[PDB]
């Protein structure tokens, strides 16, 4: 699993160098497609980890109130919220050559 605590991906939108992004494939569109597929995978993994963590801190309350207050759950959710977005993590992985891609049609 990725070390989300020590990730170098930018938190917000940043001006990325297009030449570095498409250097490996020679086509910015192919790189964008690969990055988005990896971003979908990263988002799935992050959702699974967050769901497990929330289930660990989930408290069973039988009250019929519409608003609940769980400070530990709120803190965990805030920590996950402050992390970079999945697509930013995918871009950071792509820049660091941490994404493996293969074209099935070209290798057939």
């Amino acid at each position: 699993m990725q070390d989300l605590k020590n990730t170098k991906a930018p938190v917000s939108t940043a001006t990325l160098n297009r030449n570095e992004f498409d250097s490996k494939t020679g086509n910015i569109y192919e790189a964008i497609s690969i990055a988005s597929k990896r971003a979908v995978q990263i988002n799935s993994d992050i959702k699974k980890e967050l769901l497990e963590k929330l289930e660990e801190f989930a408290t069973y309350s039988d009250s019929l109130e519409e608003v609940f207050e769980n400070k530990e759950q709120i803190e965990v959710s805030k920590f996950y919220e402050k992390l970079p977005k999945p697509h930013a993590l995918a871009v950071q992985e792509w820049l660091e050559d941490k994404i493996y891609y293969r074209n099935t049609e070209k290798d057939a």
Binding site: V11, R18, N19, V40, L54, F68, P84
Partner: protein
């Protein structure tokens, strides 16, 4: 309620196939048969059983409720009621279920005997008129002569046309046993009439043999007209034959025994206020068809006389023809208001058809719109977003974060919290906005820069904050303009926006590759003011002139200490390119403001030591992007924007009546022009010159006076305050204003054109120009004169914007299919490009024209034999300089016109992508970019 997972998986497809519809196919797709022409009961507003809106065929009107109300709620899903026959399901099914109409007699589709060319006529070889006589039930035609012979003994041939009397006579002359023969018996005499005859005749066609005979006839016939007709029939038969390998395409399917009925929701019966109903024409046409078919069936059952039966069959054919395409009929069925009814065919063509109305444009969710204000403190990739707009747009993301935080367990409670605008909502929205850009669009979107991606920031108020540098791309000012906000949702869309549509990435103009995020107005004026030099005078000594500095650090120290002026001429030691192109330290005479400007300039660009205007700024940004990457250029743009704004604010540059210096000699030269005009007039009165000559001389004198006055006014304003006059600084920098406008504010508005309606010649020029200017004030007469030109200009713009848009639309339509699909097609053909010269003046240099192209062959220097250009390589700026240094006048480069690609254009023939100053990459929609680039300036 969570939407039910409709297990009808979205049919994945990459191919669309069309063909003739078999009756069996229509029966297979149909859910039932429509007997009654009634639509609904006028009292209970419920659909009539077996009608055009019946619930047994098309589906229940109410969700999970049958027609009779026996079964209700979702618990009876999939159950068809035994009492009313209506399936218990969703109302949405009333959009997909199709009905059918079982016709008593077959009928031909208008599309295949009225369209040019007619398919049935070319298949059967019959002319259109004869086919019409067949279809509308006029004459019988012999399908099979058999043993029947003419009254005089003449041989009867196939396709022969017989009148009713002739048909009866031939039947009487034949033995009764002939009628009892099977249709496959060659001796049987078969002669029918109408669409039944048409299907019987089409089913007997050997398409292969028909193509054989048509080809042989075309090859052997000596008549040109007959050869052309044979080839034209051959065309239809070969097309229909080529249809067969793809799919079952049988010619007799052109005559339908069954007519399908489209789902009712596509032809709605909408009740209006007051008990009135709004109905589509399609309901009326279908109702007419059922009425006529039922009348034919009844007349068949009662065995009506043959003339009446043929008339009713012809009227059924007319009803079917009208329902398919009414408009082609001369006697089209019309309403009481004489408006022709809209048929099924009319739903497709025209500006209001499906294709151009509901498929090419749409309204979208997750969208917003407000007024735009200037956020000059923002970065190039950031936009300010009002709190309400962000809360509504990002509502489901905020809901997700609320459920994740455990505050609310349901989406309803999350919506309640969001609507109350609690601080936790803002705390979550601040994180949600990060990394999720929005798309800003201003109509009209003339080029692709009309939609750009920005990183949103929460702000106060109800106006969207826009970065000033995006205004030129958006053509947006802050006089009341509005922009639409579009929110991408998926990760692919977000990455697409960030990596292609981000404002920081869109520095270049795709039309030419020049920078489009150039500073303007306040920024340019401030940069010009800071970078301009001031020399010392005894009245106004300049602090710090002549000092030498070890680097920009000491210059900054002195400026902050107020020991040197901003415009002082100083000497500093810093990096600059030498004659060899290397980075060395040298003492260069400069200005403190120029040093401060160079403190933010990227190092690799050298030292910039010129007074900054818009043109020089554009060239500087282009060079900086040439030597560095896009992010560095964006940071440079942000820094110079802030610097220009700050140094324009600090100077307090204003507009006063004292800056508009009307020359004191204005009256004297107006008087001299008046004496010259008087000389011309007295010359005319003595007959020395003609009327046209006097008019031309007077115009020449007045225009010479205007030119001299413009030059004198410009000189006065320029030399005022050593070039630091605010109006002169505004004009010279290119921030705002032109020479003509300053002339009108200071000199004389000059000659004006008459509004006369002369059909032959253009507008004549009034011999008396507008002597007064806007500082002196125009008289009543002069103002009335100028109103003509003002109104003319406004009308011209308002009327020609649409023509420019239409040209853009046509270009996009003609160029949409050009996409870079292959890297190299390997052509040896190219275009020979030379420097563009007009009237002995080089308008475009050879290097500028060949910049970004791919070389055809290798090019060698004729003087030094050095390899300047390699075949198959892009022409970069360094190669441009090398070519300009060498005595080369013509360069052969690969061009789209000479490309040999199978689909679209290859990458090498296109050359450089002007939006990135890099080689074009596979997938670029170069055709749309070309169309937009041509169309935008016209608007």
């Amino acid at each position: 309620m969570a939407r039910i997972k409709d297990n009808n998986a979205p049919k994945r497809f990459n191919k669309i196939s069309i063909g003739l519809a078999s009756p069996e196919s229509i029966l297979a797709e149909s859910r039932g048969e429509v007997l009654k022409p009634e639509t609904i009961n006028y009292r209970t507003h419920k659909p009539e059983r077996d009608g055009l809106f019946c619930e047994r065929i098309f589906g229940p009107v109410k969700d999970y409720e049958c027609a009779c109300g026996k079964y209700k709620r979702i618990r009876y899903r999939g159950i068809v009621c035994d009492r009313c026959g209506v399936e218990v399901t969703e109302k949405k099914v009333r959009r997909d279920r199709v009905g059918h109409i079982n016709l008593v007699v077959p009928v031909a589709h208008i599309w295949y005997f009225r369209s040019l060319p007619n398919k049935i006529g070319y298949l059967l070889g019959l002319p259109s008129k004869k086919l019409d006589m067949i279809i509308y039930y006029e004459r019988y035609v012999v399908i099979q002569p058999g043993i029947a012979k003419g009254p005089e003994g003449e041989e009867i041939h196939k396709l022969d046309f017989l009148t009713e009397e002739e048909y009866l006579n031939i039947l009487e002359s034949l033995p009764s046993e002939n009628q009892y023969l099977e249709e496959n018996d060659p001796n049987k005499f078969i002669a029918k009439m109408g669409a039944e005859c048409l299907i019987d005749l089409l089913a007997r066609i050997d398409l292969e043999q028909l193509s054989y005979e048509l080809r042989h006839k075309a090859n052997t016939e000596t008549s040109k007209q007959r050869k052309t007709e044979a080839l034209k029939r051959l065309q239809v038969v070969e097309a229909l034959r080529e249809s067969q390998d793809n799919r079952e395409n049988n010619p007799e399917w052109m005559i339908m025994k069954v007519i399908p009925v489209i789902p009712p929701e596509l032809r709605p019966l909408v009740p209006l206020d007051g008990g009135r109903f709004a109905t589509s024409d399609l309901n009326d046409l279908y109702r007419r068809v059922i009425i006529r078919n039922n009348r034919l069936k009844r007349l068949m059952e009662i065995k009506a006389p043959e003339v009446i039966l043929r008339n009713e069959k012809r009227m059924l054919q007319e009803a079917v023809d009208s329902l398919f395409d009414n408009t082609r009929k001369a006697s089209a069925v019309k309403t009481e208001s004489n408006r022709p009814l809209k048929s099924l065919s009319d739903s497709l063509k025209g500006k209001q058809g499906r294709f151009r109305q509901n498929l090419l444009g749409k309204r979208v969710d997750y969208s917003a719109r407000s007024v735009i204000v200037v956020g000059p403190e923002m970065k190039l990739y950031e936009c300010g977003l009002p709190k309400d707009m962000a809360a509504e747009l990002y509502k489901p993301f905020i809901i997700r974060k609320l459920i994740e935080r455990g505050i609310v367990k349901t989406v309803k409670s999350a919506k309640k919290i969001i609507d109350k605008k609690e601080p936790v909502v803002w705390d979550i929205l601040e994180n949600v906005l990060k990394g999720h850009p929005v798309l800003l669009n201003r109509a009209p979107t003339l080029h692709r820069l009309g939609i750009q991606a920005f990183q949103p920031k929460l702000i106060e108020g109800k106006a969207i904050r826009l970065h000033p540098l995006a205004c030129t791309a958006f053509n947006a000012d802050f006089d009341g303009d509005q922009m639409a906000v579009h929110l991408p949702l998926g990760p692919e869309a977000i990455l697409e926006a960030q990596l292609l549509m981000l404002a920081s990435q869109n520095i270049l103009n795709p039309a030419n590759g020049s920078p489009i995020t150039v500073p303007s107005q306040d920024m340019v004026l401030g940069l010009y003011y800071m970078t301009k030099e001031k020399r010392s005078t005894p009245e106004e000594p300049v602090i710090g002139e002549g000092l030498t500095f070890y680097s920009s650090e000491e210059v900054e120290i002195a400026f902050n200490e107020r020991k040197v002026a901003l415009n002082a001429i100083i000497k500093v030691r810093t990096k600059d390119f030498n004659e060899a192109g290397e980075l060395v330290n040298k003492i260069i005479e400069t200005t403190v403001g120029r040093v401060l400007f160079n403190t933010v300039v990227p190092e690799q660009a050298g030292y910039i030591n010129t007074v900054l205007n818009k043109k020089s700024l554009r060239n500087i940004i282009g060079d900086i992007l040439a030597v560095t990457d896009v992010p560095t250029t964006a940071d440079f743009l942000d820094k110079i924007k802030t610097m220009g704004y700050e140094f324009a604010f600090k100077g307090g540059l204003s507009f006063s009546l004292g800056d508009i210096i009307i020359p004191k000699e204005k009256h004297e030269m107006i008087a001299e022009a008046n004496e010259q005009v008087d000389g011309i007039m007295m010359n005319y009165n003595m007959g020395l010159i003609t009327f046209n000559e006097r008019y031309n001389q007077v115009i020449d004198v007045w225009t010479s006076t205007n030119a001299m006055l413009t030059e004198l006014a410009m000189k006065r304003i320029r030399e005022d305050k050593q070039g630091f006059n605010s109006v002169y600084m505004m004009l010279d920098s290119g921030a705002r204003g032109s020479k003509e406008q300053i002339r009108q504010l200071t000199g004389m508005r000059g000659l004006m054109a008459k509004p006369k309606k002369s059909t032959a010649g253009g507008g004549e020029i009034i011999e008396n120009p507008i002597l007064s200017n806007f500082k002196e004030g125009l008289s009543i007469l002069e103002y009335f004169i100028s109103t003509h030109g003002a109104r003319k200009g406004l009308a011209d713009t308002a009327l020609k914007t649409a023509d420019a848009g239409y040209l853009t639309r046509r270009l996009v339509d003609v160029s949409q299919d050009v996409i870079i699909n292959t890297e190299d097609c390997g052509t040896l053909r190219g275009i020979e490009v030379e420097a563009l010269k007009k009237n002995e003046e080089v308008v475009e240099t050879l290097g500028e024209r060949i910049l970004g192209r791919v070389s055809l062959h290798d090019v060698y220097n004729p003087l030094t034999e050095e390899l300047i250009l390699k075949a198959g390589q892009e022409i970069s700026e360094a190669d441009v300089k090398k070519v300009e240094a060498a005595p080369i006048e013509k360069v052969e480069v690969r061009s789209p016109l000479t490309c040999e690609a199978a689909q679209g254009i290859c990458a090498k023939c296109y050359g450089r992508n002007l939006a990135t100053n890099k080689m074009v990459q596979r997938g670029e929609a170069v055709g749309v970019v070309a169309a937009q680039s041509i169309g935008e300036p016209g608007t």
